[PDB]
Coordinates of C-alpha atoms (C1' of nucleotides) in Angstrom, one line a residue:
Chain F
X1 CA 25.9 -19.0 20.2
X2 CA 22.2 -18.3 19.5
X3 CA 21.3 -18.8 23.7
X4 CA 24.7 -17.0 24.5
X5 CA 23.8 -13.9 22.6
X6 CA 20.5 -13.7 24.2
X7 CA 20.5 -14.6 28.1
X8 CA 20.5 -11.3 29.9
X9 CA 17.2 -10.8 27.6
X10 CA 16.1 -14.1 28.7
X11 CA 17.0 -13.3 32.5
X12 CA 15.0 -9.8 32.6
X13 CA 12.4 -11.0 31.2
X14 CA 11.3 -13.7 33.3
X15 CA 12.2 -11.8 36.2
X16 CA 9.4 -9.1 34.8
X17 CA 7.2 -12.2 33.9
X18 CA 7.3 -13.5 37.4
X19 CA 6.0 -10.6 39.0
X20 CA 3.0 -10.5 36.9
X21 CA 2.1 -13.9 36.8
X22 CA 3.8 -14.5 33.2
X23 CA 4.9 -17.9 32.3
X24 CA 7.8 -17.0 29.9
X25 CA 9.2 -20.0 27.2
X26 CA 11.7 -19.5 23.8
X27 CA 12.8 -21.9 21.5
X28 CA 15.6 -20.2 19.2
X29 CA 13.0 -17.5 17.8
X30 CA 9.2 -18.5 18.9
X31 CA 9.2 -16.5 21.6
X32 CA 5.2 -17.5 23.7
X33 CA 3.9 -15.4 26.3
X34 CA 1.1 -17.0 28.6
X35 CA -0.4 -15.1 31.5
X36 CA -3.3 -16.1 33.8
X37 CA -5.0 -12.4 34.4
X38 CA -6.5 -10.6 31.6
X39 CA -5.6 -8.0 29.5
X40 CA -1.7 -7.8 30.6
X41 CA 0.0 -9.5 28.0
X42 CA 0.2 -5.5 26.4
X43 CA 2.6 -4.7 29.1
X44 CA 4.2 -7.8 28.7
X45 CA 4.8 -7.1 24.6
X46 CA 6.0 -3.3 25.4
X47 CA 8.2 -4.6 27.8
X48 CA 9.8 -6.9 25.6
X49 CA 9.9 -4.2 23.2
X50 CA 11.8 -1.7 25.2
X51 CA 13.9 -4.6 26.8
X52 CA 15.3 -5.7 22.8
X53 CA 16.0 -2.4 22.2
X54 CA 18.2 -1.6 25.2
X55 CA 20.4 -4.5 25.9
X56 CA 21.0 -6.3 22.6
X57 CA 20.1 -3.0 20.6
X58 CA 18.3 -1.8 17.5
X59 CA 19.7 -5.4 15.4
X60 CA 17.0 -7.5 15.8
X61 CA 13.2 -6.0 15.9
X62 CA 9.6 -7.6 16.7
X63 CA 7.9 -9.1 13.5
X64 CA 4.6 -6.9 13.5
X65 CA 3.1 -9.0 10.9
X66 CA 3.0 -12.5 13.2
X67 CA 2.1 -10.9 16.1
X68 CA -0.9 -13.6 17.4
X69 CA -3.3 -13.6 20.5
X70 CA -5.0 -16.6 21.3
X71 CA -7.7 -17.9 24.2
X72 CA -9.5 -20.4 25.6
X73 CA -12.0 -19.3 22.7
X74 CA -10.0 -20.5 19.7
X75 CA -6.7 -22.9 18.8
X76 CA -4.0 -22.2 21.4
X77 CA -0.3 -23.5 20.3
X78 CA 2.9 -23.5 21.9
X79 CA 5.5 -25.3 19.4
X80 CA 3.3 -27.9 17.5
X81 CA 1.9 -29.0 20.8
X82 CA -2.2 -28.0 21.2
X83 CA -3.3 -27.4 24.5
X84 CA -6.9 -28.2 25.4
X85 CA -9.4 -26.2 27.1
X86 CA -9.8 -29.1 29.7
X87 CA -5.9 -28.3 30.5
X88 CA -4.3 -31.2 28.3
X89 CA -1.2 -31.5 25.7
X90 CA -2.4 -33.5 22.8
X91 CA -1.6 -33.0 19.3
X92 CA -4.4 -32.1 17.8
X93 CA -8.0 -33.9 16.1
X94 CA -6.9 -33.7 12.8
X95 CA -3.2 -35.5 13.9
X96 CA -4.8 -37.8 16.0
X97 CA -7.3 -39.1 13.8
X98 CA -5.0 -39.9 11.3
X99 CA -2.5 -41.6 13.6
X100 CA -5.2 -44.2 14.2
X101 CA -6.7 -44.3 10.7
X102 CA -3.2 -45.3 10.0
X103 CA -2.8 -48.1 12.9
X104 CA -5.9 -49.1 11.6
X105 CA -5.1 -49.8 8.3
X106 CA -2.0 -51.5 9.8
X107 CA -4.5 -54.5 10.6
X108 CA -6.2 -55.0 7.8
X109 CA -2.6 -55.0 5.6
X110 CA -3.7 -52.7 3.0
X111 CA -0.6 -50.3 3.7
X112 CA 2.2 -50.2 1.2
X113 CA 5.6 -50.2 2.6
X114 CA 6.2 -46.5 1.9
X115 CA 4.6 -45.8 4.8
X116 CA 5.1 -48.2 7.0
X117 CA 7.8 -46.0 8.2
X118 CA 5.2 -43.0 8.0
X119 CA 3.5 -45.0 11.3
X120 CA 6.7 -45.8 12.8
X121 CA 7.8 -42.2 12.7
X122 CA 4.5 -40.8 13.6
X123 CA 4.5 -43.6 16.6
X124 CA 7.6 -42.9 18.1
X125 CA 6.7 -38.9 17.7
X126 CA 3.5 -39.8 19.6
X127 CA 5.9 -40.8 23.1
X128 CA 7.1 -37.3 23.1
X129 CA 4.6 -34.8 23.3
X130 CA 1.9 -37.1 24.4
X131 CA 3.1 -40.2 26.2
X132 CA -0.3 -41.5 26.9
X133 CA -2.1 -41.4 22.9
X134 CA -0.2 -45.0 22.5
X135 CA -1.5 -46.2 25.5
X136 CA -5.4 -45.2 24.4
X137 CA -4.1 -47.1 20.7
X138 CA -3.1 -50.3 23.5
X139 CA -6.5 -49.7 25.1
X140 CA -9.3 -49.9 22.1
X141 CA -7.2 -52.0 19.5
X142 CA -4.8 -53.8 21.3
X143 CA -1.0 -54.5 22.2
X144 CA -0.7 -56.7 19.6
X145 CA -1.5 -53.9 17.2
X146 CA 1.2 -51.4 18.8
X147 CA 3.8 -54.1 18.9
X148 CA 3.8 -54.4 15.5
X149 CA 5.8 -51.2 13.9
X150 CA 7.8 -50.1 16.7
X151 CA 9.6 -53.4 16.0
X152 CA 9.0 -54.0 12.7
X153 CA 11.0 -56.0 10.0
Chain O
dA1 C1' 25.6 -7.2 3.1
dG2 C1' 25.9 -4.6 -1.6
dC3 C1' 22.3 -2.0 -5.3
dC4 C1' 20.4 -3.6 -12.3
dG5 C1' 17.1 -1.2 -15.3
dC6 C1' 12.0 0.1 -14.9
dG7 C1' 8.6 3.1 -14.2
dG8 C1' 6.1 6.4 -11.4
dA9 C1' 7.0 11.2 -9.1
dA10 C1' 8.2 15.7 -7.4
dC11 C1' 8.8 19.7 -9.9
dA12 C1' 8.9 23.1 -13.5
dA13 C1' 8.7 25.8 -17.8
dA14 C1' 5.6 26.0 -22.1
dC15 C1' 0.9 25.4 -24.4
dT16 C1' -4.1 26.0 -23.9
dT17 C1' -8.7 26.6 -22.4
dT18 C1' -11.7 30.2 -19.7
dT19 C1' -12.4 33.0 -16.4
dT20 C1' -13.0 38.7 -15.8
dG21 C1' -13.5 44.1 -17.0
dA22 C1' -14.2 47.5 -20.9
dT23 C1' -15.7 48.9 -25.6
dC24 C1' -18.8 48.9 -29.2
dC25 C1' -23.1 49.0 -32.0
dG26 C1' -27.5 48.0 -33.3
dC27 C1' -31.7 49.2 -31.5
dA28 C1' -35.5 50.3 -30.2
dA29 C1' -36.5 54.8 -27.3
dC30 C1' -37.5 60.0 -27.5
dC31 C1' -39.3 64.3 -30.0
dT32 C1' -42.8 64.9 -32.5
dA33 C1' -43.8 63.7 -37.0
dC34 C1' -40.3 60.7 -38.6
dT35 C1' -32.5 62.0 -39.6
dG36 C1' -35.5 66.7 -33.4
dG37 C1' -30.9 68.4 -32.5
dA38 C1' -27.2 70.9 -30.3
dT39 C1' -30.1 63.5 -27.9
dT40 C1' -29.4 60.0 -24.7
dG41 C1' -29.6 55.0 -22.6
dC42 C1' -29.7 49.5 -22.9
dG43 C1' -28.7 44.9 -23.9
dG44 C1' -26.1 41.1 -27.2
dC45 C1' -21.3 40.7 -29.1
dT46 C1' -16.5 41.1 -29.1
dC47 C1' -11.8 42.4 -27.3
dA48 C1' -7.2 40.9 -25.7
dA49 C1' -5.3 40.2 -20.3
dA50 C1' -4.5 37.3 -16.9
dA51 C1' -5.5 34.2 -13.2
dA52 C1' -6.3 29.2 -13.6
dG53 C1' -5.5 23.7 -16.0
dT54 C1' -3.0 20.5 -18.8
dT55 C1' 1.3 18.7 -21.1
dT56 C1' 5.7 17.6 -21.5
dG57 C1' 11.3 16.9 -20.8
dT58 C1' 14.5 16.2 -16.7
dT59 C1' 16.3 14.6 -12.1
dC60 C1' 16.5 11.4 -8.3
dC61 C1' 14.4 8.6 -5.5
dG62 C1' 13.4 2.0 -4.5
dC63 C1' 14.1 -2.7 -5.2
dA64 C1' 16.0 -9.1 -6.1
dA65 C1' 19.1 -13.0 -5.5
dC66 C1' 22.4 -14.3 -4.5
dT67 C1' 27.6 -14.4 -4.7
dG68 C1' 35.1 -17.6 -5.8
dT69 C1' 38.0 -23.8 -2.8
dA70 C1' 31.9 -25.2 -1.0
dA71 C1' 27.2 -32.7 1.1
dA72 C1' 23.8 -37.7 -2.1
dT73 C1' 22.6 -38.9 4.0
dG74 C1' 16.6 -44.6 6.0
dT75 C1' 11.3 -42.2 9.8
dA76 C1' 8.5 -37.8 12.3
dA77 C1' 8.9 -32.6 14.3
dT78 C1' 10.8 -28.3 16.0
dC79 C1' 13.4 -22.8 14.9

DNA sequence: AGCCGCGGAACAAACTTTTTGATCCGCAACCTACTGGATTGCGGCTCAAAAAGTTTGTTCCGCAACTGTAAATGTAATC
């Protein structure tokens, strides 16, 4: 019912995103405008204020509190996934360092059983945003490392 | 989505602390010796009167967490 109420919304404004080289994306309420050209996302945020005032009305309203511009300068985000400036998804440093701190202690057997099912968790997240991070784990410490907690007992 | 008491506020009559515009009264001046008229004039001191400065009793304004039959759910992450 949340996509129904909003899809001539959606539908407008990508048409408007297309012809100024907008990519447009939603997920329920995280709505992420991306442009190549500079300094025409301000267009693009009136436009989507004047568009969620006409068609679906006054109800719902921008949040002008989390209203966030981003670059190539700084962090750029789009729904937990971190995009490089060399034009990659990854996670992030911080995320992927303790990923392999983890599969590292894994070896060693120093891990409690608690999380054990941290790693497996965190390993089968890592196949969905980055399907190659596990194969970089497979490349410095091994397949016999990996293929020890996506099946373990 | 509704609106509890709490405390500032926006107003508005009363007190209350000075700004102003005369009036006065020593008080040295004349004038000549000295109360010189039958005089003026001049600067501190004081007077309510009233345009300014608080002080205090009343009236609305706003806002929070959740509501009456009602989910413990192996791991990570999204709105």
């Amino acid at each position: 019912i949340s996509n129904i109420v909003m899809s001539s919304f959606d539908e407008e404004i990508s048409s408007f995103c297309k012809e100024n080289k907008i990519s447009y994306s939603r997920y329920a309420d995280d709505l992420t405008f991306s442009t190549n050209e500079r300094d025409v996302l301000g267009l693009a945020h009136q436009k989507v204020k004047t568009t969620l005032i006409r068609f679906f009305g006054t109800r719902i309203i921008i949040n002008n509190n989390k209203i966030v511009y981003s670059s190539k300068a700084h962090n750029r985000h789009v729904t937990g996934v971190t995009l490089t400036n060399n034009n990659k998804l990854s996670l992030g440093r911080e995320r992927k360092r303790y990923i392999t701190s983890l599969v590292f202690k894994f070896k060693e057997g120093k891990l409690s059983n608690v999380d054990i099912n941290h790693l497996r968790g965190l390993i089968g997240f890592a196949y969905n945003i980055e399907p190659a991070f596990i194969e970089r784990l497979e490349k410095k410490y091994g397949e016999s490392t990996i293929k020890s907690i996506k099946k373990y007992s």
